[PDB]
Amino acid sequence: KETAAAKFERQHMDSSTSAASSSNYCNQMMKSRNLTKDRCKPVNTFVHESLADVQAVCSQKNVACKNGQTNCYQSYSTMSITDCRETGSSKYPNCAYKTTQANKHIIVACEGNPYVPVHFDASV
Known part of the structure; x- marks a missing residue:
């Protein structure tokens, strides 16, 4: 069974x-991890950084999640990302x-x- 952290990656x-390699990157990438095996996720973001740099965010700025929960973290600086809508x-x-x-x-x-x-909460 897939763990939460695995699903994240x-x-x-x-x-x-x-x-993003082209304006078609999202189309290609959302096909690739069996990501659209059942449905077209409304929104999905890809992070173009090492896993080490992303897992490091859990020890950076503690913030409230959009749903109200307080196990969220904001990265200290900016990251290369691709928003798929x-x-x-x-x-x-x-x-x-x-x-x-x-x-x-x-x-x-x-x-x-x-x-x-x-979980990916937001890009700001």
Whole structure:
């Protein structure tokens, strides 16, 4: 069975590239980890940084999560990210997404032992 931290890495890490490679990056990447196996996730963000740099955020600025919980953390500085937002013309199995590359702070929810990221909360 997939652990929370594993699902996190699967859904949000893309250390192999520095930025979105084309305006079609989201379309390609959301197909790739069986990520759209059942549905077209409304919003999904990819972090173009080492896992070490992202797991490090759980020891940075403690913030409230958008849902009210207080196990969230904001990165000290900015990170290379790509925001994937589902668009109009989506027709499962052909999910359609807008690719948005930006240099931003990330907010993640952390848990466990080791204390790691398990959900992507926001990019600010």
